[PDB]
Amino acid sequence: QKTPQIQVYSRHPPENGKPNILNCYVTQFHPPHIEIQMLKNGKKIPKVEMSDMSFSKDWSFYILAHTEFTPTETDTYACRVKHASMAEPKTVYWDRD
Amino acid sequence: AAVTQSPRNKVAVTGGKVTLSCNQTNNHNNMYWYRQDTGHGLRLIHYSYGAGSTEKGDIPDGYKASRPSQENFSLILELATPSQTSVYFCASGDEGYTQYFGPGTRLLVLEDLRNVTPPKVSLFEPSKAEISHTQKATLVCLATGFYPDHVELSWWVNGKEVHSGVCTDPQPLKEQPALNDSRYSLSSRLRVSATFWQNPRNHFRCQVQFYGLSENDEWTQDRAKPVTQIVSAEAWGRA
Amino acid sequence: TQVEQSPQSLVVRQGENCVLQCNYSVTPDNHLRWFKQDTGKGLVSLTVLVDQKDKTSNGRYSATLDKDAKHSTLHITATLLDDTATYICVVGDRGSALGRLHFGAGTQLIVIPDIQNPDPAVYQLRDSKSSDKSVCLFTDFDSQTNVSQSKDSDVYITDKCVLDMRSMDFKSNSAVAWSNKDFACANAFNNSIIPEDTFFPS
Amino acid sequence: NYTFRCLQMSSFANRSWSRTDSVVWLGDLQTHRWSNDSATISFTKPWSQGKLSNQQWEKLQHMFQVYRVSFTRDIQELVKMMSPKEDYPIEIQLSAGCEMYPGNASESFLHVAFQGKYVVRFWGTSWQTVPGAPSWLDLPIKVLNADQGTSATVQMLLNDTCPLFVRGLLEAGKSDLEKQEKPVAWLSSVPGHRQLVCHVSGFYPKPVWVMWMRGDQEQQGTHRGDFLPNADETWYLQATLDVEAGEEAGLACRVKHSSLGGQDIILYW
Ligand SMILES: CCCCCCCCCCCC(=O)N[C@@H](CO[C@H]1O[C@H](CO)[C@H](O)[C@H](O)[C@H]1O)[C@H](O)[C@H](O)CCCC(=O)NCCCCCCc1ccccc1
Ligand SMILES: *[C@@H]1O[C@H](CO[C@@H]2O[C@@H](C)[C@@H](O)[C@@H](O)[C@@H]2O)[C@@H](O[C@@H]2O[C@H](CO)[C@@H](O)[C@H](O)[C@H]2NC(C)=O)[C@H](O)[C@H]1NC(C)=O
Ligand SMILES: CCCCCCCCCCCCCCCC(=O)O
Ligand SMILES: *[C@@H]1O[C@H](CO)[C@@H](O)[C@H](O)[C@H]1NC(C)=O
Ligand SMILES: *[C@@H]1O[C@H](CO)[C@@H](O)[C@H](O)[C@H]1NC(C)=O
Ligand code: NA
Ligand code: NA
Ligand code: NA
Ligand code: NA
Ligand code: NA
């Protein structure tokens, strides 16, 4: 069992008010059952799209979540991942910078 | 690559425990039990991939399997029913697709053992007329008064079984067709040349192997216990 | 079901050919085997076909397989009495012991034997121990004669049955009749259409 | 010089539940998807059929449809065969395809993994275990190698069908494979010890050069991150640099990439 890496990042350069895409890349996890939610201010974003799950040369799985977001001064965005390897759900906040 | 089954034929009662066994000396990991019933092809009951493993087939209900060693695979019916009357075939094989079949086991499961009865056997000798009309002599064997209909009839000349010149009725006929548990009769013929029958050192014997009760079955009635037994009748040649 | 065989049964005269059909929906179809089963006996393998379009032979048995049509035929040339049996079609869905066998329900064949030199007669045979009991043996009639069951219910008559004296290439039909209760062999087969030339000795 | 990968993942949770899901890649572009919920394989690009006709594709799809149902039952039966040695849950992964070279050269592969460990391959004309594999797998190998019909089909898939098909794929998808999309860069800073971060995003193909710079001098404390994907099949990358706070003046991030056509991107802090 292996603890997933999680990386949060935007498609385009972030500008307050401007529509954009936010990505969450979950990697290096085994087994492949996993729950990914993207959060706005702690609430679940509704229409989150998902790429097909695949795996790397080393047999570990990966998957790309993404959704549309418009960043603001006050709003916080995150990616929450639940997986058997971890006791508690791991949350990683979008860093902005 | 030979596979043996035991018993080859069995009569049992409802509620009784029946155990069908299969032996195989080829060192095959895999064994398989089927039943054959008119209007269906063979159907898989249980199988095994090695000692200590048993798996459910297509029709596992009412049957427990058991694989104590590489050599033996047993099919156990804990509470036998009339619907388990059938011909059971066992098979084995290695990692390839060929399954090598045993010779089959016939099981009859009755409601009650009260009418079970062994045959009388009579040997009828060739007709002097037949001999001079054809130069051939036909013996006839008659097994009578038996229930159920599970019998194997065979001919023996000088201690050795003969098949040439033999035919036996394909099914037994009912002695009292109106009655419920009618006893059966079965006939057979052995035809030989007149000179062979005329030789008084040739010894002819009709043998009926009857399947009925075992030494463990309960017996309440006053007559002798109708156990699995051989009954036979006998005659010497004469000029 | 997944394996259908046709015809369900057929009657053919010795020396004639017959064709046996097997059609299936089994998937995948690795191989197809034909078994022969004599009444009350075991499964004897005749041939195993493994290719996309396949042909095999084994003496008088020859067979074919077309995997695209999902169809097999078994041909028996010059039928003999001993071909009287049930013929079973089996399809295996793997080329290994991971496979399941899918059994067809079978086609019943009855071969009617050729009686060369008929000589219909009815003899009386006496019991070896108790000489005063007896049976009536109707024998040597050809295969165009039917043996009907008895009018009297206390009289017993068996169906016909053909024996083969293998060393002399000789075949003969017979039926047997007996009764305790009046009963003689001249009267025994009265309820059957028997030949006019039938020998009644005495 | 492109690699075609068919990646299969199968989960068997208990004796009566399983799923099998596949995605197919040519280089780093997805060409096919096959969800357990779908009877058929899905094209994810217009050219995913390659140069195969509609009838050839049907026959190939049909062979896979039979494979999927059969694989599922075979694993379930192999589990029963090894019991109690090995047990559910089970994860099986297959990596298969061919790597294309110039001329008519290629190497095909079929690698199998069990609970995350590479244990089995198809090689030559048979299944074989690899170094480090547990000894109990010799019985499953022996059984799978009994199947001659599967061996001939697999050999043909590996030796003939893969390279032929991938050659046709490359022809039909040349323009999607050779596309150039331009990176866009931006800068940011986090925690007197600062970390500076050069974000680069939207570039295809994957090779790219990113260094922190003072005029004409490469700051060799630059730490390049991993390549992270975007949804539209372009890439994202960040290069970080550690510095003393106040010393950030005069630093730039320089990005070189094939789509820019000589005119590199330079962003000054
Ligand atoms: C990305 C992966 C994509 C490439 C995939 C290429 C494969 C295409 C094969 C096409 C032929 C095939 O479908 N074989 C299947 C159907 O075959 C039947 O039908 C065939 C006709 O269609 C032939 O008649 C055969 O003779 C007949 O047996 C077989 O049923 C085959 O066995 C399917 C699975 C093969 C396979 O994947 N094996 C991987 C090795 C797994 C090791 C497991 C280890 C293990 C052990 C114990 C416990 C737990 C785990
Ligand atoms: C298919 O090719 C193999 C040899 O190529 C290797 O195995 C392939 C399945 C694939 O993984 C390639 O990339 C590999 O380079 C043939 O296997 C040889 O067969 C001969 C005789 O049949 C035998 O003497 C050799 O030992 C085998 N070679 C090896 C390396 O094991 C195979 O026969 C080819 N089959 C067909 C149908 O084309
Ligand atoms: C042996 C596989 C490699 C060669 C196959 C060439 C045809 C490629 C077509 C893409 C379909 C992918 C199917 C995935 C099958 C699976 O793993 O379940
Ligand atoms: C099998 O696994 C699934 C998924 O984990 C579960 O929901 C289901 O109840 C299980 N079934 C059995 C029979 O244990
Ligand atoms: C996967 O597909 C098979 C066949 O389509 C189906 O029977 C099975 O239930 C599916 N499994 C899941 C977990 O959906
Ligand atoms: Na049956
Ligand atoms: Na004797
Ligand atoms: Na048939
Ligand atoms: Na006569
Ligand atoms: Na795995």
UniProtKB/TrEMBL annotation, chain D:
This is CD1d1 antigen. Antigen-presenting protein that binds self and non-self glycolipids and presents them to T-cell receptors on natural killer T-cells. GO terms for biological process: innate immune response; positive regulation of interleukin-2 production; positive regulation of interleukin-4 production; positive regulation of NK T cell activation; positive regulation of T cell mediated cytotoxicity. Heterodimer with B2M (beta-2-microglobulin). Interacts with MHC II and CD74. Keywords: Cell membrane, Endosome, Glycoprotein, Immunity, Immunoglobulin domain, Innate immunity, Lysosome, Membrane, Signal, Transmembrane, Transmembrane helix. One of its GO terms (cellular component) is endosome membrane. The keyword Ligase does not apply. The chain holds residues 25 to 297 of 336 of the full protein. Residues 183-259 form the Ig-like domain. It is a single-pass type I membrane protein. It is found in: Cell membrane; Endosome membrane; Lysosome membrane. It comes from Mus musculus.
